[PDB]
Amino acid sequence: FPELLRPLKLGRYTLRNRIIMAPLTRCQATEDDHVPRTESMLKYYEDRASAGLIIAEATMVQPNYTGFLTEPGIYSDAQIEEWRKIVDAVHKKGGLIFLQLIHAGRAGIPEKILQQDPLAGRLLAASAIPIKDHRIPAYFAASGEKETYGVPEELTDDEVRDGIIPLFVEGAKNAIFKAGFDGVEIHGANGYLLDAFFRESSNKRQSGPYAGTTIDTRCQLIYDVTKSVCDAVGSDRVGLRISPLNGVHGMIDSNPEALTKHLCKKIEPLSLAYLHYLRGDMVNQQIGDVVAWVRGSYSGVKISNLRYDFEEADQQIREGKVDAVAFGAKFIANPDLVERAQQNWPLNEPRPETYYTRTAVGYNDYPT
């Protein structure tokens, strides 16, 4: 896999290879303080530092606005302190690491958020449309009871512009200037806040710069947040992730192609370190050639993801369709994935049953 193992210029950095570790929520942080549990999390990331680039798991930018109960945050000094240790360990191995910045939006856990600053103690989204497809996963629920997502409040353009955006900015500054991350990745995918403004199913705003009436206005929040973050920490230290076809939380847009292409053209002027996207849906309902769409509408670094294997990854990079591929499940199960690629070693099979144990089990128990 010569193309997959070839170095790559990304932002102000140079990846040793194009085997990227996708952001992976593992819930290895303290419950209410959302402080990275360094003991386990450090070894986890250090063990995978041979990755061309590691994209750290979705990390909270709004205090207490938790979507996964015990995910990391990057808004407090306590969180910054531990992250720094983790980032330092990755860098000592010669690796690179970006931190994915997230806001759960309507996917926030009610029992935790509502039990709490005009943005505090509230569920926020583009529109008062609750997730209805499924319950809150038991490994994310605040109690043993069957919990369900709530009806969020419609964010005013003012709260968005002056409340939400500044949080992403401080979070990026904290991550890069304090924790020492090489960069950050704006989480504009998988049904969370930004994706909720992005796709039509969850954005029914009648007016404002973030209206759900046009593809351009729906792309505005992703752009504004990304632009503001770029001005604050430099665009060559900023990446963005999207998932135009991911149906999670009932997310759906009728024009995934035009939406994706339009967003590419819109962020093009930002000169981002990269654009990262899921090329499909977890199930075979929503389909489309996202690789093709981004390819013909974006001139920057393209990082694709979803059900890739070394060969397919190597082949698309060879054909110039993508510049790099981020692996999710394979990195969970293979700390030394890169090495296994260099020699075509077989890969450990992942075990979804233990993705969120919060213990060493299914976290640091995968052999090298």
Ligand SMILES: Cc1cc2nc3c(=O)[nH]c(=O)nc-3n(C[C@H](O)[C@H](O)[C@H](O)COP(=O)(O)O)c2cc1C
């Ligand atoms: C346990 C688990 C946690 C994940 N956490 C995140 C996350 O924090 N942010 C994100 O954008 N995607 C997240 N994903 C989605 C993955 O980044 C990836 O896009 C998905 O696993 C499909 O890629 P794969 O086929 O290589 O596994 C997660 C997936 C799994 C299975």
Ligand SMILES: O=Cc1ccc(O)cc1
């Ligand atoms: O499974 C957890 C998860 C968290 C954030 C995502 O974007 C996707 C999945």
